[PDB]
Amino acid sequence: SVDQKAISTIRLLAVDAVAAANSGHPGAPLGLAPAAHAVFKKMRFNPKDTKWINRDRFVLSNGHACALLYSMLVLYGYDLTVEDLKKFRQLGSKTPGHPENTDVPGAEVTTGPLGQGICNGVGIALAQAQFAATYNKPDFPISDSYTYVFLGDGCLMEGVSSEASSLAGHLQLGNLIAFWDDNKISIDGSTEVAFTEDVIARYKSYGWHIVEVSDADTDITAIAAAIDEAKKVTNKPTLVRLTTTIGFGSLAQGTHGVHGAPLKADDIKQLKTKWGFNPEESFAVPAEVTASYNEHVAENQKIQQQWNELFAAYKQKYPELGAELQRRLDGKLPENWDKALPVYTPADAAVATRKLSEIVLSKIIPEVPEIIGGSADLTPSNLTKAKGTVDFQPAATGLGDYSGRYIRYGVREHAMGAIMNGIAAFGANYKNYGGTFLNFVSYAAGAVRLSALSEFPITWVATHDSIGLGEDGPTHQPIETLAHFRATPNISVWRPADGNETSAAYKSAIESTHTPHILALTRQNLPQLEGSSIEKASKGGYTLVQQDKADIIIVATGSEVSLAVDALKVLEGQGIKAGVVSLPDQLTFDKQSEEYKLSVLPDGVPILSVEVMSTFGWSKYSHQQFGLNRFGASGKAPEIFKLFEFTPEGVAERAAKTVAFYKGKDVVSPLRSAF
Amino acid sequence: SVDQKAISTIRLLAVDAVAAANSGHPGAPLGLAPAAHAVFKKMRFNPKDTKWINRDRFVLSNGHACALLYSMLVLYGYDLTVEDLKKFRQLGSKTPGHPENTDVPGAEVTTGPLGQGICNGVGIALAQAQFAATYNKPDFPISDSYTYVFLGDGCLMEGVSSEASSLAGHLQLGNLIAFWDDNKISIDGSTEVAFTEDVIARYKSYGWHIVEVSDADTDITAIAAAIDEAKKVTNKPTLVRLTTTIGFGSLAQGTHGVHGAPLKADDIKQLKTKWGFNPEESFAVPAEVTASYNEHVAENQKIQQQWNELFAAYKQKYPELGAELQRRLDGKLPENWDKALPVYTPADAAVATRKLSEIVLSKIIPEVPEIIGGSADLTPSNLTKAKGTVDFQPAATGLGDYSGRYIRYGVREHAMGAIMNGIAAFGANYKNYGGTFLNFVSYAAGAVRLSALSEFPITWVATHDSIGLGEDGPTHQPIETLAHFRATPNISVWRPADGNETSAAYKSAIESTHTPHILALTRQNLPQLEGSSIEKASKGGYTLVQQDKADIIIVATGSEVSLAVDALKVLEGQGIKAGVVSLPDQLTFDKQSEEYKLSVLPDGVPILSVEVMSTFGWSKYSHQQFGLNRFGASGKAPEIFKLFEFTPEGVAERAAKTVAFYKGKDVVSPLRSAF
């Protein structure tokens, strides 16, 4: 049949791609080709409009199997060709060894790190439910799409998927349909060596629906029926158990050796002949397969055409919502939304930056409907919920509604991070955030790094940034955390010192389209600074106190800017004139012009950094660094600062030593380099 | 009864400690006091010998509840007193706001970051099973102890606990007995808002035994019976569901407000009067409670006394095993064990450092019985198993034995990291390791940081360290990872360049008693270096190529040392004389004498670092830094190095620019500072 020919075509494209690269993973593509064929036949999508907001989404969570995904995209006429398949795993190609959303048309997210994709699917489905609840009206199903996810044993072993699966079951996400590649083989061999749990019983315990397909090597009728069954269960996510043979058809099928290395040439020949293909030919695409797939594309394009007319009629019937939806699909924030950002003066009271963050959210959430977010069981400590908003919950629970804007993530930082990536991936201008303590953002590093690589504008509201949190002690107090994330490409790490800087940090985070943000916020109160503004803090680094005859410049962030200002006064009494630079975001600063940066960190003056955490990175901006390179302590926060000499006198002492160290030396800006 | 008085004493000590600090968590201590009383009565331990190797272990995974743990330790006469309780959460005290094994007698591990402690308990139980299988003989139950863990809803939400619980069920760890504080309250309120899964059904799906105690606020008889029941189930870990009221007895019992803030003074008064205590008194310890607890201590001490005689008789009956056990309990490695480390010369072939690591393990595992380890489903890629060894599995599976030495962790990096901490915490000189790709050590950051804070000598065998891995691409290629871990206090991060350096890295990792190690290892082959040795590499940094008239010194690590050596030859043809420093471990180097370090990085010469990852940290050792501060690429590894100019010519160009940049300047060692 044509279906059988399509499945063989998919299998052989994937094998041939791996063969051409002499690198990659043929086993799961061989095993999952029937399911991929069946799922894509049920999916609504437009290869010529990858951003249609009512498309079904597909996520390959077992991203090593991406020769399968690329083969589907090529066969369906996405902007990816057989010539691209021939360049699988080659430098600069559109077919990298794991899928990258920035590079691969039709890759919704970046996978390869196991466990992430299923969580991203949870986030796509969460966003779809919120979006539909916000916009759909009687006779206007603006959003009714599904989220289809493939995942393997490795994804099911990774704890992040347990977190997201528990939460997705709680949230009754009925448009999520996941498929487990139940092939009983991982890199170390049989799953009997390490993974003997009853997966289906576990998924039932989360409140998922289950469908089992015992012969998923051939039974596409049952796979299609499982999708239809899943669509009838509107209040539970579904797991479809696909019992497959890894490497189906290979001489080496059912073995770990077929997971992750190219097949032998004679094996590929026998695959081809058993399936009616020419063993002398590679990258074959039978025209009848193209014709069949083109029929489905044409039907999907007519569905999108009708959706466009539905949307036009929606704008006439619901003018306000229609204009809001249009603006979001255009990628534009509300005009002058930033006029809602709070502004402060030096006469205003001292406030912790966690509380300033609460106040920002309170003002901007009503103005910007595409902001949603939550906390990982730290809502009353991170201060992440705007009073009066409703939680995102299924209405059946009585605890919220899908139109809600605040997500109770539970104690699930890693899944929160990956779910945030999925919400961003949904599109529609979602600007979404997640609260935890800065030290526990580290639990989510796997997902945070992918926010950066995937270029998603997600935001971590990362409170309790330092030893300033006090008594909870060193298991809670960051030391290495900012260095870790600043050292990751494409992460804006804001550490605002006061009210105006906190507003600048949010302006950046919400306006972002390609850069994730981490906002490092305090438990303890900080004064409003003389010289701060949204305008200057938006530059990432700025001169807070200008001193034309400076003996030293002190560059600082966050809670240490006020400390630097107090140290300047101590230094005055010692006959030393200091300037102060505030550096709320190193990435934003780095992106400013060379001349702007040199105006902040000029030649001819020693520069001392002050930040109560690791000194790593700080030599970009300073000659000497005063930081904290040891773990913290459990005690009242002011006593910890005193212990470590983060006091006006301790800063002044180190500043005076810095001035003395450079006496008789020629000093150039830390911004200069040899290459 | 005295039991009732003991429970009240525990509750009120915990509340009074929180009150004195005006900080901390009274709710779970109030709810778990009955269970703590019952468990400690069943436990065998010696307050005067916290290291008795056959003690039962207790782990408080819900570490915020540590006022409960501290109260138990005080009441039992550990080296912790009521005066220490009065200093709860105060700077420098022995009663920090979360338990620290380095600080608190009777704290086996450091908890506070949720999810970790239960995984540590899995590791303690894994070690006990391996230890018992290694040493026990007929009539000689050298090791027969249990591992008791308390954990809450937050621990059950964290994915790391799912990973470890799946694995513990697979491993049939019948001496693990965990207790879930089922109080239905977390920080964000009722668990109905975020955590509605059927926990018991999930634990059954992992192969755990379940006991439910429906009135754990009072029914210590049932808690004791649950322990007895768990002890009869020798082939499954047990979860005991303790249905409790958070804050039991408080006016605010059963609310989120009692989780994490001090009780009101009038609330404490009514607690005291309802339980027969004086509301005017704090830190009361009724002498009848002390007497009852002392009886149990005296009995436990007689049990340890008999164990000491059993051990003496064991040494007579099993002389070789007895001497091995004695040496391990003394904390000593085998005499001259390091003579087994492989040594190489520059005439030997190029080898990837992952393969050099395999070869080291092959030589040292037979010589050092306290080495055990595993991989997170990457055994044939990390090369972490010595040929001929048997896996750690329950014999019932046919796949291994508890005497085995190799652990199949599955795709569970985070739990692997926390399990490694538990194996170290068991003691008996265990030197344990865990393999994954360096980029996925980041999945385990929560546990890695605790290895550092807890001072455990665990080892990560972290292969595939860079873009040198090639085609798997940027989702697999570290950039930020070494900077992150080097910026964490107390982590040795070895990046050996060749065979001799890899042996030095293992010498350090195995000899460690207080510092975790990460060994960053290559996929790709590297040459044996002229000038390397175990002796010099043991210093962490050393002069590989000395040049008395150097125009520049190039400092490098790992795969970039050979690159620096090749660049030196290019530079010679440009009339530039270079020296080369190899810096296999920055932490070890930092610990050398100031004079040694200056002999490696002298004044008066520009120094350029070369390492194909983040430049963060490198200014400690260099004036200019050539690194990779962007994500990688999917392609053949040599092509990626060429793309980013990590070639002999690209290094030479930057070295020549560095020499020119410092012409006419006075240059002092990067090791100098102002303070």
Ligand SMILES: Cc1ncc(C[n+]2c([C@](O)(CO)[C@@H](O)[C@H](O)[C@H](O)COP(=O)(O)O)sc(CCOP(=O)(O)OP(=O)(O)O)c2C)c(N)n1
């Ligand atoms: C978070 C995480 N941890 C481990 C992995 C590693 N891993 C993976 C890879 O890194 C690919 O993403 C490796 O396959 C890698 O490409 C090779 O080991 C490289 O070989 P070499 O030639 O360099 O030696 S896949 C994998 C588990 C496979 O088990 P599954 O059951 O999920 O997939 P299957 O049905 O067997 O195809 C596992 C465990 C990952 N991708 N993500």
Ligand SMILES: Cc1ncc(C[n+]2c([C@](O)(CO)[C@@H](O)[C@H](O)[C@H](O)COP(=O)(O)O)sc(CCOP(=O)(O)OP(=O)(O)O)c2C)c(N)n1
């Ligand atoms: C990995 C991780 N994530 C989050 C936490 C935070 N957290 C915790 C803490 O950081 C303490 O370790 C906080 O309590 C913290 O002390 C306060 O929020 C500070 O308040 P503030 O005055 O500074 O505002 S506890 C916690 C969840 C509590 O739920 P459980 O059900 O585990 O405990 P319970 O029965 O309610 O006592 C949660 C979620 C953690 N300890 N570990």
Ligand SMILES: [Ca+2]
């Ligand atoms: Ca599998």
Ligand SMILES: [Ca+2]
């Ligand atoms: Ca709880």
